[PDB]
Amino acid sequence: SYSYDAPSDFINFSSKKKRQWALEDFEIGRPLGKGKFGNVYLAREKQSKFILALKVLFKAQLEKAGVEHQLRREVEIQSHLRHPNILRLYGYFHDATRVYLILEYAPLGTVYRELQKLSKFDEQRTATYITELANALSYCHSKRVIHRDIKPENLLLGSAGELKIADFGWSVHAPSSRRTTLCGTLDYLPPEMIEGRMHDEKVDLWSLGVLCYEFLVGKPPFEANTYQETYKRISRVEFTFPDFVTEGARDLISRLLKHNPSQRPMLREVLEHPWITANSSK
Numbered sequence: 001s002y003s004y005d006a007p008s009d010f011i012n013f014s015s016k017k018k019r020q021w022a023l024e025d026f027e028i029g030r031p032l033g034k035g036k037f038g039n040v041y042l043a044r045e046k047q048s049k050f051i052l053a054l055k056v057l058f059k060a061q062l063e064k065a066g067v068e069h070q071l072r073r074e075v076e077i078q079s080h081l082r083h084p085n086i087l088r089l090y091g092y093f094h095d096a097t098r099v100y101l102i103l104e105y106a107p108l109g110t111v112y113r114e115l116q117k118l119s120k121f122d123e124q125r126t127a128t129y130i131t132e133l134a135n136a137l138s139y140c141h142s143k144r145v146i147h148r149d150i151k152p153e154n155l156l157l158g159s160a161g162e163l164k165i166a167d168f169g170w171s172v173h174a175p176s177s178r179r180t181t182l183c184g185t186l187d188y189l190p191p192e193m194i195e196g197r198m199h200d201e202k203v204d205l206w207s208l209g210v211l212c213y214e215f216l217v218g219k220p221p222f223e224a225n226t227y228q229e230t231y232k233r234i235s236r237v238e239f240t241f242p243d244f245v246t247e248g249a250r251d252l253i254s255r256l257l258k259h260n261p262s263q264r265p266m267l268r269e270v271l272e273h274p275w276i277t278a279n280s281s282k
């Protein structure tokens with residue numbers, strides 16, 4: 001069933017067909033990280049010496065959890081996207097045991113690692129990330145695609161330090177049929193998923209507000225000691241700002257963290273926000 005609506009043809013990374021991708025086309029390097037069902041390796045295409053990232057998923061693990069359909073959604077959606085702030089999925093291929101994803105290589109790693117080293121981000125670095133993320137989110141929503149898994153671990157950094165969305169393992173194409181699945185990461189779950197209501201593209205707006213908070217504070221706003229307490233604080237929208245948070249950021253985060261999904265602003269309003277337009281570098 002590993003036949004996706006996504007490229008699997010060999011790509012000549014030196015110009016501008018018939019042969020398909022194969023593991024013999026790539027030199028493998030150190031692993032960039034471990035995933036849900038397999039590591040992600042730094043790789044190099046042999047003919048062009050082009051550096052990219054190879055995400056390996058073992059077919060045996062995906063069937064124990066029954067996530068073959070979400071992998072189909074991940075590969076088919078991401079491979080048809082073209083945006084500077086979105087990680088490229090050049091193609092895929094598979095053998096008897098594994099499924100391979102030929103991903104764009106982000107040289108500067110994850111935003112998550114930059115946040116661990118700097119503890120918290122300044123306002124300019126935050127506003128620029130939010131602008132780059134909202135731009136890529138607006139491109140996704142223009143194709144009726146909801147990411148539904150916005151978190152620092154899924155935000156990578158390109159050559160110029162620009163932000164690029166990664167990991168579409170929970171994304172979905174919802175043109176009008178609005179979805180129902182409880183999915184994502186705990187601290188970034190929107191209220192409509194915890195309370196069992198049907199959600200739309202406004203869940204990326206909520207996770208954007210949670211992300212802007214953690215960028216400035218260093219901890220997500222609804223962080224708790226258990227899943228039990230985190231569920232309540234997200235449902236109540238129970239969070240407070242430290243004193244060093246400015247009124248401009250205090251306004252944007254509060255606008256994005258509305259319990260009512262319809263009251264959360266549009267991505268254009270986030271891009272035109274006074275706090276953004278004042279501190280964003282892009």
Ligand SMILES: Nc1ncnc2c1ncn2[C@@H]1O[C@H](COP(=O)(O)OP(=O)(O)NP(=O)(O)O)[C@@H](O)[C@H]1O
Pocket residue numbers: 032033034035036037038039040053055103104105106107109110153154156166167169
């Ligand atoms: N193109 C890339 N460049 C550099 N590192 C990457 C790249 N793709 C993935 N990684 C690394 O792999 C990690 C995530 O891999 P992935 O297989 O998507 O995990 P996951 O199972 O989807 N869940 P999560 O690890 O939380 O994102 C990132 O945090 C990076 O450390």
Ligand SMILES: [Cl-]
Pocket residue numbers: 122123124125
């Ligand atoms: Cl800065």
Ligand SMILES: [Cl-]
Pocket residue numbers: 224225
């Ligand atoms: Cl506490």
Ligand SMILES: [Mg+2]
Pocket residue numbers: 035036167168169170
């Ligand atoms: Mg994934």
